[PDB]
Design an enzyme around this catalytic site. Sequence first.
Site, short mmCIF file in Angstrom:
data_model
loop_
_atom_site.label_atom_id
_atom_site.label_comp_id
_atom_site.label_asym_id
_atom_site.label_seq_id
_atom_site.Cartn_x
_atom_site.Cartn_y
_atom_site.Cartn_z
N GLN A 44 -7.44 -33.00 6.10
CA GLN A 44 -7.36 -33.75 7.35
C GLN A 44 -7.97 -32.96 8.50
OE1 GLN A 44 -3.41 -35.02 8.28
NE2 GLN A 44 -4.07 -36.35 9.95
N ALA A 45 -7.89 -31.63 8.44
CA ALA A 45 -8.64 -30.81 9.37
C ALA A 45 -10.13 -30.93 9.12
CB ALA A 45 -8.20 -29.35 9.26
N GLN A 90 -11.37 -35.17 10.31
CA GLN A 90 -11.28 -35.63 11.69
C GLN A 90 -12.19 -34.83 12.62
OE1 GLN A 90 -7.15 -35.52 12.66
NE2 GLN A 90 -6.64 -37.36 11.48
N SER A 93 -8.70 -25.70 7.82
CA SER A 93 -7.75 -24.97 8.63
C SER A 93 -7.00 -23.96 7.77
CB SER A 93 -6.74 -25.90 9.30
OG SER A 93 -5.88 -26.48 8.34
N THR A 132 -4.17 -28.01 1.94
CA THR A 132 -5.49 -28.41 1.48
C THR A 132 -6.57 -27.55 2.11
OG1 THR A 132 -4.65 -30.65 1.25
CG2 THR A 132 -7.03 -30.37 1.22
N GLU A 152 2.84 -21.58 8.15
CA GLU A 152 1.52 -21.03 8.46
C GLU A 152 1.37 -19.51 8.31
OE1 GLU A 152 0.37 -22.35 12.28
OE2 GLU A 152 -0.03 -24.41 11.63
N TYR A 208 -6.42 -35.55 19.73
CA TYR A 208 -7.31 -34.76 18.89
C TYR A 208 -8.77 -35.14 19.09
CZ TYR A 208 -3.45 -32.80 16.15
OH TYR A 208 -2.35 -32.10 15.74
N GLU A 251 -29.85 -15.54 9.50
CA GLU A 251 -29.82 -14.55 10.57
C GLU A 251 -28.42 -14.31 11.10
OE1 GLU A 251 -32.52 -15.60 13.66
OE2 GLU A 251 -34.27 -14.81 12.61
N1 GTP Z 1 -9.04 -28.97 15.72
C1 GTP Z 1 -8.25 -29.82 15.05
N2 GTP Z 1 -7.22 -29.35 14.35
C2 GTP Z 1 -6.54 -30.31 13.72
C3 GTP Z 1 -6.77 -31.66 13.74
N3 GTP Z 1 -5.84 -32.32 12.96
C4 GTP Z 1 -5.07 -31.37 12.49
N4 GTP Z 1 -5.45 -30.13 12.91
C5 GTP Z 1 -4.86 -28.84 12.53
O1 GTP Z 1 -4.71 -28.82 11.13
C6 GTP Z 1 -3.60 -27.96 10.79
C7 GTP Z 1 -2.72 -28.65 9.78
O2 GTP Z 1 -3.47 -28.81 8.57
P1 GTP Z 1 -3.79 -30.21 7.92
O3 GTP Z 1 -5.29 -30.43 7.93
O4 GTP Z 1 -3.11 -31.37 8.51
O5 GTP Z 1 -3.35 -30.07 6.40
P2 GTP Z 1 -4.24 -30.25 5.10
O6 GTP Z 1 -5.26 -29.14 5.03
O7 GTP Z 1 -4.87 -31.59 5.10
O8 GTP Z 1 -3.23 -30.09 3.89
P3 GTP Z 1 -2.15 -31.14 3.40
O9 GTP Z 1 -1.18 -31.36 4.49
O10 GTP Z 1 -1.58 -30.63 2.09
O11 GTP Z 1 -3.01 -32.33 3.11
C8 GTP Z 1 -2.93 -27.57 12.11
O12 GTP Z 1 -3.30 -26.26 12.49
C9 GTP Z 1 -3.46 -28.62 13.09
O13 GTP Z 1 -3.56 -28.11 14.41
C10 GTP Z 1 -7.87 -32.15 14.49
O14 GTP Z 1 -8.21 -33.32 14.63
N5 GTP Z 1 -8.57 -31.14 15.11
N1 GSP Z 2 -44.62 -11.94 23.32
C1 GSP Z 2 -43.77 -12.74 22.68
N2 GSP Z 2 -42.78 -12.21 21.97
C2 GSP Z 2 -42.00 -13.14 21.39
C3 GSP Z 2 -42.12 -14.50 21.47
N3 GSP Z 2 -41.11 -15.11 20.74
C4 GSP Z 2 -40.42 -14.12 20.25
N4 GSP Z 2 -40.91 -12.90 20.60
C5 GSP Z 2 -40.40 -11.59 20.18
O1 GSP Z 2 -40.74 -11.41 18.82
C6 GSP Z 2 -39.56 -11.04 18.06
C7 GSP Z 2 -39.12 -12.22 17.24
O2 GSP Z 2 -40.16 -12.49 16.27
P1 GSP Z 2 -39.98 -13.50 15.03
O3 GSP Z 2 -41.36 -13.87 14.54
O4 GSP Z 2 -39.22 -14.73 15.32
O5 GSP Z 2 -39.31 -12.76 13.79
P2 GSP Z 2 -39.59 -13.12 12.27
O6 GSP Z 2 -38.68 -12.40 11.38
O7 GSP Z 2 -41.05 -12.82 11.96
O8 GSP Z 2 -39.30 -14.68 12.19
P3 GSP Z 2 -37.88 -15.32 12.06
O9 GSP Z 2 -37.55 -15.33 10.52
O10 GSP Z 2 -36.90 -14.15 12.42
S1 GSP Z 2 -37.59 -17.01 12.86
C8 GSP Z 2 -38.57 -10.57 19.11
O11 GSP Z 2 -38.81 -9.21 19.44
C9 GSP Z 2 -38.88 -11.48 20.28
O12 GSP Z 2 -38.52 -10.86 21.51
C10 GSP Z 2 -43.19 -15.06 22.22
O13 GSP Z 2 -43.45 -16.24 22.39
N5 GSP Z 2 -43.97 -14.08 22.80
MG MG Z 3 -2.95 -32.38 5.35
#
Ligand code: GTP
Ligand code: GSP
Ligand code: MG
Lengths: 429, 429, 432, 432
Positions: C11-12, C15, C131, C136, C174, C215, C245
């Site tokens: 359910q976490a 939703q 969660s 679950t 919990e 929620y 990355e």
């Molecule tokens: N962020 C967020 N947390 C939620 C939401 N609904 C429930 N929770 C959180 O979910 C936790 C309770 O777990 P559940 O998801 O209801 O339980 P479950 O994993 O489905 O397990 P079962 O009860 O056995 O089915 C609590 O920490 C709630 O705060 C939601 O819509 N958003």
């Molecule tokens: N001069 C210049 N430097 C850039 C530009 N975009 C990124 N950089 C620099 O280059 C580096 C990033 O390079 P990048 O090519 O993305 O790495 P890569 O490993 O080759 O590619 P990627 O897998 O991580 S997306 C950083 O040091 C960043 O500051 C740009 O348009 N001009």
């Molecule tokens: Mg549940």
Amino acid sequence: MREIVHIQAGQCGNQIGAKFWEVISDEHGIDPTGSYHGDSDLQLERINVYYNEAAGNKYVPRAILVDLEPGTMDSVRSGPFGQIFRPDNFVFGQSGAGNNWAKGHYTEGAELVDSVLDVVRKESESCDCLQGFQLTHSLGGGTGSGMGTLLISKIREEYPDRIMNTFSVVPSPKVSDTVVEPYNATLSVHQLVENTDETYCIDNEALYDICFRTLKLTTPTYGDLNHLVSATMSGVTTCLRFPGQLNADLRKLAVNMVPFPRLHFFMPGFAPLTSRGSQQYRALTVPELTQQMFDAKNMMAACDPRHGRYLTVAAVFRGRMSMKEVDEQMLNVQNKNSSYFVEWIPNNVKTAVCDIPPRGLKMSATFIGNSTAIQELFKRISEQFTAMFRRKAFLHWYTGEGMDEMEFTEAESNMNDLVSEYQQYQDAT
Amino acid sequence: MREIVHIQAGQCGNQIGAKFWEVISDEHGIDPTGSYHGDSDLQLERINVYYNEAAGNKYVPRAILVDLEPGTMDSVRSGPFGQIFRPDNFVFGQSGAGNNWAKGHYTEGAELVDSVLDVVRKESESCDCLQGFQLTHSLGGGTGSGMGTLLISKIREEYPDRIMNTFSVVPSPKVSDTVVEPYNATLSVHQLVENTDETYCIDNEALYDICFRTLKLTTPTYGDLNHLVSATMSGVTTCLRFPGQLNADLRKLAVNMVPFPRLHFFMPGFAPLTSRGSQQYRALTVPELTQQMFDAKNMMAACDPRHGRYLTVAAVFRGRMSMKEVDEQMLNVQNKNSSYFVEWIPNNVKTAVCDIPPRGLKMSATFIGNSTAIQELFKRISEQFTAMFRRKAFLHWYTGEGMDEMEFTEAESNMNDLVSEYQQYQDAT
Amino acid sequence: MRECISIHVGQAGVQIGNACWELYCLEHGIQPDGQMPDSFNTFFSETGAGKHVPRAVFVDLEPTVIDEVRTGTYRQLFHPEQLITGKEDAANNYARGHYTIGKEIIDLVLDRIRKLADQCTGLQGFLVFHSFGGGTGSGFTSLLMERLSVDYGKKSKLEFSIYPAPQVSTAVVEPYNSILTTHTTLEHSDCAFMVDNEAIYDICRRNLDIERPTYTNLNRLISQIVSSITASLRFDGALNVDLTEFQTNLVPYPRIHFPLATYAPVISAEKAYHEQLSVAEITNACFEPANQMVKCDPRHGKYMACCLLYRGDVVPKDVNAAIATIKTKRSIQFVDWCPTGFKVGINYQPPTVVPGGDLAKVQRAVCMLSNTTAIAEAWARLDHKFDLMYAKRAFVHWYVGEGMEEGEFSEAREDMAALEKDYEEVGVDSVE
Amino acid sequence: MRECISIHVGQAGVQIGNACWELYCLEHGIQPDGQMPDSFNTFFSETGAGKHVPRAVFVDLEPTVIDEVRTGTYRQLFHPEQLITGKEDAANNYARGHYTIGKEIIDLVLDRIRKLADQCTGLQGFLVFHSFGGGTGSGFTSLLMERLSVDYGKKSKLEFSIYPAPQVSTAVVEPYNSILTTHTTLEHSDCAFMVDNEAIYDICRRNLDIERPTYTNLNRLISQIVSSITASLRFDGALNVDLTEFQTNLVPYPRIHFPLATYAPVISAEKAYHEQLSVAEITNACFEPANQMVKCDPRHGKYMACCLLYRGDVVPKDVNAAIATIKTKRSIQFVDWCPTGFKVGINYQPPTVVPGGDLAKVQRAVCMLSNTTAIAEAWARLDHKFDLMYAKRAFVHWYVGEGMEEGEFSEAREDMAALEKDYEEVGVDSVE
Ligand SMILES: Nc1nc2c(ncn2[C@@H]2O[C@H](COP(=O)(O)OP(=O)(O)OP(=O)(O)O)[C@@H](O)[C@H]2O)c(=O)[nH]1
Ligand SMILES: Nc1nc2c(ncn2[C@@H]2O[C@H](COP(=O)(O)OP(=O)(O)OP(O)(O)=S)[C@@H](O)[C@H]2O)c(=O)[nH]1
Ligand SMILES: [Mg+2]
Ligand SMILES: Nc1nc2c(ncn2[C@@H]2O[C@H](COP(=O)(O)OP(=O)(O)OP(=O)(O)O)[C@@H](O)[C@H]2O)c(=O)[nH]1
Ligand SMILES: Nc1nc2c(ncn2[C@@H]2O[C@H](COP(=O)(O)OP(=O)(O)OP(O)(O)=S)[C@@H](O)[C@H]2O)c(=O)[nH]1
Ligand SMILES: [Mg+2]
């Protein structure tokens, strides 16, 4: 040849240059696009000093602009002539100053200056034979001062032979922008007396006087205030971008105006200045330029030369004029004002004659004056400085950026020794 | 004459070549159909090196593509230029790598290599005089490494005289794609130092810097990253497909760049690099290419050459340019950087001049540089390698594919001897 | 031409898988009737006529929740031989899941699987969804995974098991199922992924802004995780990843192979705006301890290896920008012997929206598959719960009389404690 | 690209901030739905789609007044994670704001903030708006500002705290909260701005000609002050000003950092005519003792430093003309050691009208941020109110039984009197 690299620093350091590069572009005929749409041939003959040629028949300024915030740099590129500069050169920080000389020169200035010294050193090498640097900044704020003086400390170490001059803005006597501007002045002046070859002390108090009294403007904006400072700046290197019948340059203005390598704080002057309603009735001839310069109110410094004495006087004229009509005036202002000049330097008047006028006006001139009148300027700073320092007010902000009290003593005591030096040559025999 | 067989390996090995064959097709004017629709006459003069002529005025590439999955090969044929290749040449496996050097070279690499060596040997015989092979792959992944090195072990045995060079991709310092990339590197490098004549270490860390700082791109994809690597690859053999005033080739770059047959790991460089808004203001002349190459940030390796020393420098220029303007720059970078070059090799600058530029740009260059700066690269691998090997982590995946521990010792000890060799020539007299 | 089947147990199993196969049929234009108006060769074997069937197996010991499939919406989609039912349930017993009821239908389950690998040619690996709590999700999986290593072996097997909660335990016994199902799956399953319910309830309340999930809402976010891993097969990407990355980059030693998953971003429809959803924004949401799906603070333990997958319109440059931040944070630390613990994955296609779901149509998504030493703290409590119930010999007599020797507990306890000390070796750093 | 987030704490935090973020959305063409048919980057993070969000944080311990935002006009404008609520209130207790209720949600507040600073890049500073009266404005701020100095520290932090009135005290135990919240914020908050309610009632009666204001009319004039400071960010000006500059020009010594605000001109729509509203006209209205917003006559004390901000069409020349007048008036005097106590700020854009407000569409406006020694006279009465209530040990037992040691009052009284003599040193002039 003889190229110049221009540097700006601060919000005040930016807006002057934006007005300044607006003027230089029109002096050669350069569009707001960046291409060439001039008419004559002497516009392009010396274009390479403030420009580097680019392809496609477009030209760029050799400019460097520095600020600690993107705000002021945004305003420059968005206004007119916001496309002419190369966009790489705009250096701007993000911290901000905080209007603090400690933060401007130690904490945030030291981090940004390495990004500046790349662009500085690149523009120096691309030119064939570098002439020297010029800097436009201010002393009140943080980025104009702390980031400003840090460059001049690093420029001179990598380039000792190159001349280095500053269009700073000394704060006004009456109104005051920055509360900690006495700390900002004293710490910046201590750097200016070591790595600068001359200084053009301009005061905003003089600029509000000129635009109101002489130009007769009701609401003068900074675009009208910063327009006159640029005309002075262009009038200094006007003999380098154009041929003339007596060619001066930055180096001729360096040696002739500086008798002793500490005394290098100067005041500028500009002429003519015709208002809107008063432009047609005034006869604009050569002696009319002479009697307009040498009074107090046409100086761009907030100090009367009557209190002190002149040492050296530079005169850079612009326009097709005769030498006898110039030399008669330059001789005559020595004779009746024989008290105001100093005795133990004979012939303390330097004459420079260009050829090409600026736009619109038929002829022009540019005044550079050295004086002992500036001792009232630094003492008015020095009196305000120790008045704050005796109570240790606003001290921990500078101290909290790793700054010792001995730095303030070595700054301030070196100032008063300079004030004593101007006191010495005022009453020498 | 002098034909070349191209090989690819890995997802990274594919996408580079798809970008690479896109560039070479436009350098001659080949349509995505496969026919010829070019304009000039020098496009067809040396077409036979990367192509075999088929009937009906259609041409096919001489390509070999290898990967361990049908995924990446599907992407190549479905995109653009997915019809140009002969469909017989596509070798692809079905297991997949798993990102494992053990699986790439022993288990699944050995099964697919026999299907590769048929297609390799067929394309070698059909050419008149074979020049040599070039390989594009990576060292991180599995198919690029293990399937890659296995070919080079089998290429050299059947063809010893033919030159063999690799455009690998060394992994970056800061980010890391593969957790077991130290195992992937050390096992692949031990093969590269026996059967390869040179290696072009390219790092993705440099590519994200160049596309952001210099190109001024907001979202640069890999298509913009892998575009610059192809321009380097095309710039190496650009003097073989076109006539020139000084013709170099793979063999001239082999002997001039390799002093000792172990030291064959190189770093590339490309110039010029103009952004979109910055392309018009920059003056694109020959010395402007020179000062752009030799700084740190324009290298495609993640290591400053200031830490180490250069041994040999190759310069492959493209375009109608004068030799004196080239030789002035190549001499000048030796003089002021006399510390950075080595002493006991005089004139360590190799110059190569082609004729035809790439598409659009008026002129271009391609930099190949040998240095001792790469000893920081392998030691950063070698430090990460023994750090994983001391705990025997991730070891059983390689071991589970039939691999002994002595393989890791003979790989790693041969690496540190090579690191000592670069340590020897760094501080020689 | 590479394929990968999937098993769903209890359910976490069903939703969870109901929402999963719902999602796959939407991402390939697949009607529930099998008609459709290449790429989808991975999870579907095409018939001769215009009809497609999944490569799926649904198994449950109790026929209650299976009948939902044969009557519900997805009725004509499956081959009815693949819906294996049962009569009686495990009823939360490991013994009935593995010995009594398991040994009577396990041959029918294996027989349908070997038919599936023959019609495939690119067989990469397996998927098993259950969660640890229910009988679950524990018993029936334990018998199933043993048979695969007998049969296939070299193919990489993955599990999305619902690891029991620390506190919210629905079932009572919990601690008996989870120990015994681990003693079986340790040797066979090379890689398994844990997802707890309780942290998902914390995610659904805090970020989805849904106070009342059933929620179903849990089943949607688990289904995104499943599709995010196999996305490199169903679509071409820039950097692919393969199912071989994952066991390379996430198994440092052949005992410890339990990573845990985390999905990001998790936002609602009216909150889909008001943030830009950048890659740097969502990647900090991955390593954040609040956003994980397993109730284990990772700052207690140490990250051994990490594997990130990006899908959608993902900038390759900004992924390098994002990881450069996280390697500098002091709060997240890695193990001393591993310097490079990342595996990057890029694919072009986004995860789509299920109609009537809650997540919006985003442009990008990350599934973080990282492995840590912090999970061992959960094992110590679960083993301490085991010692309490076994000390009084409670609930044992239900297990003895169903084909199980009583001494199997004392053996399976020792191997669990042997796994318990294996984490203790990895936890210490290097010498000198 | 410079940004500033802002924190609003309690009922004093939100109701002020409601009119403020109303005003910001009108000054950028921002519909309340987020659509719009650069400049506005400061206070807005743009999404991928055509929608904007503020960089704001609204926090309150009691969820009453927050629900006005989620139901009112500005509903779709905010990320609902940023509207942090609570359950129980501090109920005018410093102990419940700092010990009981504070230590349970303070981590959630800090965690959202650190997400905000990551998506920003120009983070300047912080803004914290509260009151000294209420327990949330006192207690929760005191815990918050300590964490910021632990976390950020160097960022400049600003506070628009509602300083309690001399006479119109709504709450009863305001001499207990205001002392204890000062003993915490003195070390961490580098700069704080005081605004009293009572003087605004005097301004709304005398100049606005509105005899019956609610809290709305108070919230409008405070909102002008907030927009006048951050105007230099949202718009370019000729001479900018930053939020780090304010702690430089207004902190002469690291203890005394309490300036006070005054907005001018304050006129009505039918009185918008009949005066020309020149810069020299409005600047005399700034330093006028009747027009301030804190009930402290500045002619009793001495101005330490002043910071003027002009916005609109402002003549740069006439600002130099205006300050030259005020430095000559005998009635306004400065402190002897400071010759140059001005900080001038010019921006181009005017403050707009809120629809259905009372101020008219002026062409210029001033926000005076000056610091004086006249505020210490208010501290002496507030400390004298503290000594009266503590002498009879009244209302103490509500504070002892909520995680607070009884001796904490006697410590916090001494540091307050230590601050009290710090004004006395600045008041005297120089020697010789
Ligand atoms: N962020 C967020 N947390 C939620 C939401 N609904 C429930 N929770 C959180 O979910 C936790 C309770 O777990 P559940 O998801 O209801 O339980 P479950 O994993 O489905 O397990 P079962 O009860 O056995 O089915 C609590 O920490 C709630 O705060 C939601 O819509 N958003
Ligand atoms: N001069 C210049 N430097 C850039 C530009 N975009 C990124 N950089 C620099 O280059 C580096 C990033 O390079 P990048 O090519 O993305 O790495 P890569 O490993 O080759 O590619 P990627 O897998 O991580 S997306 C950083 O040091 C960043 O500051 C740009 O348009 N001009
Ligand atoms: Mg549940
Ligand atoms: N300026 C202003 N002050 C307000 C406003 N509303 C209330 N106040 C002030 O808030 C103070 C009372 O404290 P509250 O801010 O109401 O209390 P609190 O910080 O929310 O904490 P509690 O006591 O838990 O409700 C008084 O000083 C009120 O003047 C408003 O709209 N504007
Ligand atoms: N001539 C001139 N002076 C200006 C102008 N704007 C400001 N100034 C002067 O310059 C100084 C302010 O300079 P400014 O650049 O803002 O300081 P900063 O520290 O460099 O910048 P900031 O961080 O504080 S916003 C003051 O002395 C001011 O009077 C202008 O347009 N022209
Ligand atoms: Mg309240």
